Structures are given as C-alpha cells and as structure tokens.
C-alpha cells in the first residue's frame, strides 16, 4: 500500500471530501507518520518479537570525508559522513548499513556512546562502524585507511519518521518517485487497522468541533460559535 | 383518458354550466392547467415530495407504472472538441436536450493500458465541485477503470473525467413529457412548443390524478384574489 491509499482511507472514514475542510491531508500525513512510530514502539519494545519486512525502509546515502573537529594536524583521524542528515532509527528492528548489496559487506551500525571506543581489538581493526551523531549526520569510523574511499551506502532500518526516510529512498529501477503519495507506506498490514482507527479517533472529535467563525475582534469559542 | 375525455371530465368536475356558481374554461386554459398539473405531479413524484404518494422515482410499483413512459435510453460516441475543463483527461458529451433528470448513466472505456479488460463498462458518478480536487487523487472514489466522474457544465454538456479513454457514453433519463393539448391551437399559441393536439403518454392510471390536480389549479387561478 502507498501513502495515498492510507491517507484517503482516513479521509473517507472521516468524510473530509470537500476542498473547504479544516483538516487537510497534511494533518492526515502527520498523524499517520506519528501513530506509525507510536504503534511500532508499543508492539516491539516490550519483549523481542519478529519484525516483518514491511516496517523497514532503505534510505540511500552519499559519504564524504570530514575532519574530526577541524583541519588541524592533532585533532585526530578523519571520518566519513553522509552528505545529508539521516533519520533517527527506532531501537526495535535490525538496523543495517550495506554497500548496495544487502547480502554482502560488514558495516556495523552501533550506538553513539559505543563508537567513542571501537576497534581496539586487533581482530576488529578492519570493521567499519556507523552511528548517527547529535549533528544529525551518519558518521563512519574505522582503523583501516581503506574505509575513506567508501563513496555510497544504503541504510535499511525501521526509521522513526517514515516521511523523512521516504524522501531519501534509493532510485527504483523505473526511476525516482517525486510524489510522496505514490511511495509505499512502511508498516505491516496487520497494524494498518489499528493505525487507521487511532487516527480517525484522533480527528473525529475535532472534526465536529466549533470554530471562532465570526470576524469581530472577539473570541467566539466560549459561545460555541 | 383521451383528449375529449380530459375535457368532458374536467368540465364535469368543475360543474360547468350547472345551476350553482361554477367555473368555465376554454380548451387552451384546460390544456394549460392539465400540462402544468402533469409536470408538477411528475416532478413531485420523481423527487418524492408528494405527500400523497411519498415515494420517489422507482421506489414502488405504483410510481414505476406512473413514470414508466418517460424513461428513455440514450447512447453517444461523439465528443465535443473545443471546451475548457477541470482536467487534462476531460471529455465532453452532448445531452439529448429533452432530458429532465438523468437516472442511469454509464460509460464504456476503450484503452490499451487496461489490458484484457478493454471495453469495460464503467460507472459514471456525478461528483460535486467541492469533491473534485480531493477526488482526482482518491483511489477509492476517484476516476479508475470502473468509475468515471461526471460534471454538469454550460450548454447542456457532461464533462466526463476519466483515467482511461472514454469511447461510448450511455444514459437513461426522464424525458420532457408531451404536453396535454386538447385542441389544435390557433396560430401563435402553443404549449411546450407544440400547437397541435398532444395526448398524455403516461398510463391512464395517473390521468385522473392529473385531472384532479388541474381542477385544483384552475380553482386557484380563478380564486386567488377573492
């Protein structure tokens, strides 16, 4: 299913058909994307369960060498990092950066705190480690100077905001999909009715609520105007 | 009832030339009131706003038997070329121009994109202009292989918004009924553009109701200032 199908299921269950509606499809996209993460956390944070392939998304990154702090000689070894800021992953699935082949390569996505200290083990000096810095970028670290030649990677994870990760998908075979509405929404079909009814309950009450509808330099809501 | 019988019964119900005070109408006046009663009654019956029947266009056998003889089917393949629509994929079809209310309306599609489903009969959905923008992108209520949106526009036209090419346009509507003209009217006079005699095409069941309504309209016309 696509963003369009879910959006219009919500709009039609609310019957927000007219162009002169207070609640536009943008409200629906926002609520759907937030309730997706809400449900995914409620389902897959208590105890460890199998996560379906539907919850995952591959964002698609270009890496650039950057200094550790600045261009100084003693500021430490340099890192690669993604050109653009990366979405925050949720901590429930199998995050993975891979070199355009999911079935190949060993690039490890770890925590920020762990990545301060990695690679000291002599047998772990050739492993590339990844983590999202507080800057918002995905940083890479390794003790093997070869890692600085890496140009492109794909990052597959259950990203915390589906819209951000959908804007950064890799090109499909046909080509890029400009409209987010034509892209696929990242959630399992078993969790679609819960998500829809939560969003419809969210917007049902506000749908029929009054407005400050007179232009009289006055607040008209206490009068149910 | 025939035209002679409309006139004789109309006179009998109005007590024309009886001893008591009464009302006498010319055959043109009779035709005017009969046609007005006919059109009022069938519009009220279609919309279901008649309190006596309280039923809509085909909601019971009675109303079916009443308005069965106005139901006309129409088919067209010609598209009006130069007109301004609300979408790139909008085609315009002329309306028969004797249409009163469109009751069934369906569209056959001829396009190679919908493979092995070619010639699919598609439901033409009348859509308001509020709903149009949010229905172009709608995958459940918008245009598709099995659904076409129809909008009314100027000059008796139907703008059909479809995703696939529209080949044929089928309709079934309620027609302008023939007026009830009891006499060959003189030069200049006519009812609904008809000067010669015109019999009611509906069934004789509703002719007596039309007569009653016409009599009441006549009494209203003569006794609205007294």
UniProtKB/Swiss-Prot annotation, chain A:
The keyword Ion transport does not apply. The keyword tRNA-binding does not apply. Homododecamer. Forms the tail multi-ring barrel with ring protein 1, ring protein 3 and ring protein 4. Residues 206-225 are annotated as: Disordered. Its main location: virion. Coiled coil: none annotated. One of its GO terms (cellular component) is virion component. This is Ring protein 2. The barrel is composed of five stacked dodecameric ring structures. Podoviridae-like phages usually possess only one such ring. The tail is thus rather long. It is found in: Virion. Keywords: Virion.
Curated annotation (Swiss-Prot), chain B:
It is found in: Virion. Keywords: Virion. Signal peptide: none annotated. The keyword Nucleus does not apply. GO terms for cellular component: virion component. Forms the tail multi-ring barrel with ring protein 1, ring protein 2 and ring protein 4. Homododecamer. The barrel is composed of five stacked dodecameric ring structures. Podoviridae-like phages usually possess only one such ring. The tail is thus rather long. This is Ring protein 3. The lineage of its organism: Viruses, Duplodnaviria, Heunggongvirae, Uroviricota, Caudoviricetes.
